[PDB]
Amino acid sequence: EIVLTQSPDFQSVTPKEKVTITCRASQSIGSSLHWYQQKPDQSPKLLIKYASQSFSGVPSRFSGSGSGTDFTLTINSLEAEDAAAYYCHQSSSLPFTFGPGTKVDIKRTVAAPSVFIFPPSDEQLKSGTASVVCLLNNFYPREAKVQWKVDNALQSGNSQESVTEQDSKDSTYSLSSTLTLSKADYEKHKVYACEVTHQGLSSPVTKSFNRGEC
Amino acid sequence: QVQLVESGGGVVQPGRSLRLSCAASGFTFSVYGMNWVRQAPGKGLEWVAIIWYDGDNQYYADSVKGRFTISRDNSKNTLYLQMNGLRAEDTAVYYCARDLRTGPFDYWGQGTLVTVSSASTKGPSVFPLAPSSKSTSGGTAALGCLVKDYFPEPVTVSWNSGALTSGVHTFPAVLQSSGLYSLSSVVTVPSSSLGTQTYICNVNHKPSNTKVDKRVEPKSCDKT
């Protein structure tokens, strides 16, 4: 199977500026390469067919180009509605394949997250489990790092995190991180902390609490 | 207008069979090739299979060849995907797509969700993420609720029966090692409102007919 690689994986663009996405095929495919746009919770839509032919209804600010193995999708004078994932697909040889996709989001000024931490509720503790939640609210860019520390020991493998889609009004993101322990394990330690690293923070921000406090 | 409508999605245990279908309309079905493309949660598009306009030829992605069969009924304008020996990695949204002479996929359906898991339908336990000193930065307080251990997706979450929407952030669910999902919904409000307004997160889980309205009351853990 022909493998398609795309770059970059993520790109932020200021409205009116340009986005340039590239797709490379593991083997030559002539001009049998197409581009699709896909917004969150929506079906993909055809943008460019056969490398450079714009599909009906697609604005001229979109331009696809290339032949052989290297192809390019350029979005000139980007508008807000262009924030989406973009995928290339080759129809040169079976089995047909798609690139891994490229996410384009709206670029704005860096915004540090406001961090909040939540100890487990007495209700959950009673059920035998303790979930500690750390919220990083309204930040930009998307890249953020959360590290859990219990009595200053770095944790790994016992937390999961989720991130919202870019806000349509302030262009920010929010992220939740949950540390989960058994009730017994939770009661063996004193201090629980989440350490947040982000571009909007000159130094990492740590929010913490002593078990029993809030 | 061209319209493609997929169906058949749902929860299926690993190793079992499931058939998806796609109703087509608005075009001469018998002269277009048809495809199936899927997308695993949070991942990219993956081509699955293609069937020629007359149904006399079919091709498959390496990952499903031998296990899936694509077929069509040109008298009923319907496309089918018979899936056998389902694996956890087959979990995805499956899209029906029309091709142009085996070229670009010009029209796509709305997709149907297939979840391959051994988990049993279960409603969530909802816990409060109470607003307190550790969750109040100045005049703004953060609060929310943890919707834990439910299956399958999805759950809906609203605040104060929908009256509260600004500042709300309901995060995408995460699949736990237990096979059950979990998600959190939070909202920021003025700290000045905590004493005169009750915050309730309304949680609904249709698959289990579960409805929970958890009050999220302020909490103090000070020795003062």
Angle at CA of residue B24, ends B19 and B26, nearest 5°: 175
CB-based contact A72:A65 (threshold 8 Å): yes
What is the domain partition of chain B in residue ranges?
2-118, 119-224
Listed by number, the residues of chain A in 27-46 with a beta carbon closer than 8 Å to a beta carbon of chain B are 32, 34, 36, 38, 43-46
Q: B90: closest CA among B55, B121, B49, B59?
A: B49
Rama region for B85: left / alpha / beta (φ>0; ψ in -120 to 50; rest): left
Domain count, chain A: 2
CA distances to B118, B179, B195 from B150, in Å:
13, 9, 32
Secondary structure, 3-state, chain A: CCCEEEECCEEEECCCCCEEEEEEECCCCCCCEEEEEECCCCCCEEEEECCCEECCCCCCCEEEEEECCEEEEEECCCCHHHCEEEEEEECCCCCCEECCCEEEEECCCCECCEEEEECCCHHHHHCCEEEEEEEEEEEECCCCEEEEEECCEECCCCEEEEECCCCCCCCCEEEEEEEEEEHHHHCCCCEEEEEEECCCCCCCEEEEEECCCC
CB-based contact B14:B117 (threshold 8 Å): yes
Do B140 and A32 count as a contact with CB atoms less than 8 A apart?
no
Strand partners, A86: A37, A102
Please give the distance of CA B33 from its chain centroid, rounded to a whole number. 28
CB-based contact B84:B68 (threshold 8 Å): yes
Residues A183 and A102 in one domain: no
Using omega within 30 degrees of 0 as the cis cutoff, is the peptide bond preceding A95 cis?
Answer: yes
User: Structurally, what CATH architecture does the domain formed by B119-224 represent?
Assistant: Sandwich (2.60)
Q: CATH code at A61?
A: 2.60.40.10
Listed by number, the residues of chain A in 2-31 with a beta carbon closer than 8 Å to a beta carbon of chain B are none
Interface with B, mutate which of A5, A38, A42, A43 (most B CBs under 10 A): A43
Residues A5 and A76 in one domain: yes
Amino acid (one-letter) located at B197: Q
CA distance linking residue B171 with residue B164, whole number of Å: 16
* Minimal C-alpha gap between B16 and chain A (Å): 25
Residues A82 and A114 in one domain: no
Do B45 and A44 count as a contact with CB atoms less than 8 A apart?
yes
Residues A79 and A116 in one domain: no
Expressed in Å, this structure's resolution amounts to 2.0
Residue A63 burial class via C-beta count within 10 angstroms: exposed 0-12, middle 13-18, buried 19 and up: middle
Exposed e or buried b per residue across A104-122, where buried means at least 16 C-beta atoms within 10 angstroms of its C-beta: bbbbbeebbbbbbbbbbbe
CB-based contact A73:A47 (threshold 8 Å): yes
Residues A158 and A199 in one domain: yes
CA distance linking residue B143 with residue A117, whole number of Å: 10
CA distances to A25, A65, A138 from B112, in Å:
29, 33, 32
Q: Chain B contact for A128, CB < 8 A? A: no
Residues A68 and A140 in one domain: no
Residue B219 phi/psi, 5-degree rounding, is: -140, 140
Residues A123 and A204 in one domain: yes
Residues A145 and A120 in one domain: yes
Rama region for A77: left / alpha / beta (φ>0; ψ in -120 to 50; rest): left
CB-based contact A20:A69 (threshold 8 Å): no
Secondary structure, 3-state, chain B: CCEEEEECCEEECCCCCEEEEEEEECCCHHHCCEEEEEECCCCCEEEEEEECCCCCCEEECCCCECCEEEEEECCCCEEEEEECCCCHHHCEEEEEEEECCCCCEEEECCCEEEEECCCCCECCEEEEECCCHHHEECCEEEEEEEEEEEECCCCEEEEHHHCECCCEEECCCEECCCCCEEEEEEEEEEHHHCCCCCCEEEEEEHHHCEEEEEECCCCCCCCC
Residues A167 and A195 in one domain: yes
CA distance linking residue B50 with residue B124, whole number of Å: 39
Count of A–B CB contacts within 8 Å? 151
Q: Chain B contact for A164, CB < 8 A? A: yes
Final residue before a domain boundary, out of A70, A88, A107: A107
Final residue before a domain boundary, out of A80, A107, A134: A107
Q: How was this structure determined?
A: X-ray
Residues A116 and A95 in one domain: no
Identify the domain containing residue A80 by its residue range.
Answer: 1-107
- Domain B2-118: state its class: mainly beta
Positive or negative torsion for Cα A33, A38, A44, A49:
negative
Secondary structure, 3-state, B180-209: CEEEEEEEEEEHHHCCCCCCEEEEEEHHHC
Residues A92 and A11 in one domain: yes
